[PDB]
């Protein structure tokens, strides 16, 4: 028998220390990484459950393993809630990640060497979008699949183009999934043949992937087999349960309010950067372009980190520097807003970031500025705790 009191702290203190350190880090650092969030304790509760013990290859009611009667309920809930949230006729909640969701779509709908028009295969690219040009490329190259993703993207126009040349329409709903769930951005599901997203970024759920589709029996069967046995074996049933409860949380009225906060916070930050003379490329994420100031993204993210502001360097369009250096920062506010930072605080935060960037060439002034900003960041982190009682 496993004693239920077995724990990491007593057994594996070095590992435990890294965990408690990370917990503390999530409190006392402001996180501006666009692809991160903070998920609810209920999601973590499901991920920490005994459902990890169940092998469940196949789909609810159609498993290759016995004993799946109760995990079928959890998975069905996740599927039904995903369909409800996105007005889909089909949802596949087994993908382990966005990478596996996307791979499965490719395997479902394309054969290697097929042509693919987008933003093993013959790739054609397109670069506000010029739909006239996308259509011209579609007609010229006859893609098997057209991919669109995330201004306001016109899904109905992509459907029109796909229809014209008999292509599948694949939408990667990355970075607008939460806005779509909240009714704040046009839904690609009615227009695409298939839609993917991760479940941990703007949806704020567990780490994993999700496939959605409007009704098409043949495409749905291809998607089924592509996920399993195509890309995966057994799904992570504890993470699927976590997906079920996260999708329930995402349907709450509070979630649309949170999504608007995400947007308002980004707008406040943008207005501060612009007011301080920093160029923005822009939405819940934006780039701070650092060309005018001769600052590298690497240089800026290091300095901001020392001030307990975690951001990622990022190449600007046509960046003259390598991707390991870059001339920009990428900022997103999903995590900022999730921990309750408001638009005014976001505005001030960006101003603190500008104080750092302005001082970055002056060693003494930069040290002085980082010291000051740290104190301000600590006070904000304490005022807006991520988890607690």
Residues 129-188 that bind Cl ion (CB under 5 A): 177
- 49-88 footprint of a copy of itself as x/- string (CB under 8 A): xxxxxxx--------xxxx-xxx-xx--x-----------
Shortest distance, CB of residue 41 to a copy of itself, whole angstroms? Answer: 4
Angle (nearest 5°) at CA 203 between 199 and 207: 30
Number of residues that bind a copy of itself (CB under 8 A): 88
Partner whose footprint covers residue 203, from Cl ion, a copy of itself, none (CB < 5 to 8 Å by kind): Cl ion
Longest dimension (CA), the chain: 67
Cα dist. 180→132, 352, 357 in Å? Answer: 26, 32, 34
Question: Would you call 201 a catalytic residue per the annotation?
Answer: yes
Instruction: Please state, in angstroms and as integers, the Cα–Cα distance from residue 109 to each residue in 46, 105, 361, following that order.
Output: 33, 6, 51
Determine if residue 323 is labeled as part of a ligand binding site: yes
Residue 371 binding result from a copy of itself, Cl ion, none, given CB thresholds of 5 to 8 Å by partner type = none
Residue 61 falls in which region: left (phi positive, over 0), alpha (psi -120 to 50) or beta: left
Contact status, residue 239 vs residue 207, Cβ threshold 8 Å: yes
Query: Which one, 58 or 98, has the nearer CB to Cl ion?
Result: 98
- Residue closer to Cl ion by CB (options 177, 304) is 177
By beta-carbon proximity to a copy of itself, the closer residue of 15 and 257 is 15
> What are the CB-based long-range contacts (under 8 Å, 24+) for 381-384?
381/27, 381/28, 381/29, 381/30, 381/308, 384/339, 384/340, 384/341, 384/345
Find which of Cl ion, a copy of itself, none residue 4 binds, CB within 5 to 8 Å per kind.
a copy of itself
Q: Spell out the residues 6+ positions from residue 113 whose beta carbon is closer than 8 angstroms to its own.
A: 120, 121, 122
Binding mask 205-234 toward Cl ion (x if CB under 5 A, else -) reads ------------------------------
User: Between 311 and 347, whose beta carbon lies closer to a copy of itself?
Assistant: 311
Binding of a copy of itself by 312 (CB under 8 A): yes
Q: Judged by CB under 5 A, which stretch of 192-200, 214-222, 261-269, 376-384 contacts Cl ion? A: 192-200
Asked if 207 is an active-site residue, the reply is yes
The region that residue 340 occupies, defined by phi over 0 for left and psi between -120 and 50 for alpha, beta otherwise, is left
Task: Single out the catalytic residue among 198, 296, 326, 369.
Answer: 198
Residues at the contact surface with Cl ion, assessed by CB under 5 A: 6-7, 10-11, 177, 198, 201-203
């Amino acid at each position: 028998m496993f004693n239920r009191d077995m724990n990491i702290a007593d057994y594996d203190p070095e590992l435990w220390q890294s965990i408690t350190d990370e917990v503390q880090r999530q409190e006392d650092h402001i996180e501006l990484i666009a692809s991160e969030n903070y998920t609810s304790p209920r999601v973590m509760e499901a991920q920490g459950s005994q459902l990890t013990n169940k092998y469940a290859e196949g789909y609810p009611g159609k498993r290759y393993y016995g004993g799946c009667e109760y995990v079928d309920v959890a998975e069905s809930l996740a599927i039904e809630r995903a369909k409800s949230l996105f007005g889909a006729d089909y949802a596949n909640v087994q993908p382990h990640s966005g990478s596996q969701a996307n791979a499965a779509v490719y395997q479902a709908l394309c054969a290697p060497g097929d042509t693919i028009l987008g933003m093993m295969y013959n790739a054609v690219q397109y670069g506000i979008l010029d739909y006239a040009e996308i259509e011209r490329l579609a007609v010229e190259h006859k893609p098997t699949m057209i991919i669109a993703g995330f201004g306001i993207v016109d899904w109905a126009k992509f459907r029109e183009i796909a229809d014209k040349v008999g292509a599948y329409l694949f939408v990667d709903m990355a970075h607008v999934a939460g806005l779509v769930a909240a009714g704040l951005y046009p839904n690609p599901v009615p227009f695409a043949d298939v839609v993917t997203t991760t479940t941990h970024k703007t949806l704020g759920g567990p780490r994993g992937g999700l496939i959605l589709a409007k009704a098409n029996e043949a495409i749905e069967k291809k998607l089924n087999s592509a996920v399993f046995p195509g890309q995966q074996g057994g799904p992570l049933m504890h993470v699927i349960a976590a997906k079920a409860v996260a999708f329930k949380e995402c349907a709450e009225p509070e979630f649309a309010v949170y999504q608007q906060q995400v947007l308002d916070n980004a707008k406040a930050m943008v207005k501060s950067f612009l007011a301080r003379g920093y160029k923005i490329v822009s939405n819940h994420l934006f780039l701070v372009d650092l060309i005018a100031q001769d600052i590298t993204g690497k240089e800026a993210d290091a300095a901001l980190g020392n001030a307990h502001i975690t951001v990622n360097k990022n190449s600007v369009p046509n960046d003259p520097r390598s991707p390991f250096v870059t001339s920009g920062l990428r900022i997103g506010t999903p995590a900022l807003a999730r921990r309750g930072v408001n638009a005014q605080q976001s505005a001030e935060l960006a101003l603190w970031m500008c104080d750092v960037l302005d001082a970055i060439k002056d060693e003494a002034k930069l040290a002085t500025t980082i010291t000051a900003v740290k104190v301000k960041v600590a006070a904000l982190c304490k005022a807006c705790p991520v988890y607690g009682l």
